[PDB]
């Protein structure tokens, strides 16, 4: 009586677009960041969507593509979070992202994807540290 929903949020362009939409709506009220962080992140979030819009239109939304989206999505947010704005602490930042991610997926499809959030959060937190100092050249 519901959707299985156990898959990548990037599998459907409709889903991805709405995901980022709901994401920012919850993220904007999250502690740790600031409007400056949100602004940049929102724009980059669009680039994420644009890639999926293209994949679904070119008919190339294959698993191995989405695998790459996993890493880049996490690191894109990390680069921003690592800039230390607003609340500073990356701990608060990363925890906020995951809350918005799970909540946004909750509104888009109705189910929460657990594994995908676990991966992203650790990658964010990992890539962020390497973005605070210029070792990610």
UniProtKB/TrEMBL annotation:
Where the record annotates domain Spidroin N-terminal, the positions are 9-133
* The name this protein goes by in its record: Major ampullate spidroin 1
Q: Which organism is it from?
A: Euprosthenops australis
Q: Lineage in the entry?
A: Eukaryota, Metazoa, Ecdysozoa, Arthropoda, Chelicerata
């Amino acid at each position: 009586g519901s959707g299985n929903s156990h898959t990548t949020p990037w599998t459907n362009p409709g889903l991805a677009e709405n995901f980022m939409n709901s994401f920012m709506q919850g993220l904007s009220s999250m502690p740790g960041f600031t409007a400056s962080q949100l602004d940049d992140m929102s724009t980059i979030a669009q680039s994420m969507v644009q890639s999926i819009q293209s994949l679904a239109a070119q008919g190339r939304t294959s698993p191995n593509k989405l695998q790459a989206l996993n890493m880049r999505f996490a690191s894109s947010m990390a680069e921003i979070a690592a800039s230390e704005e607003g609340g500073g602490s990356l701990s608060t930042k990363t925890s906020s992202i995951a809350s918005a991610m799970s909540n946004a997926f909750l509104q888009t499809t109705g189910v929460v994807n657990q594994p995908f959030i676990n991966e992203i959060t650790q990658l964010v937190s990992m890539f962020a540290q390497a973005g605070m100092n210029d070792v990610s050249a």
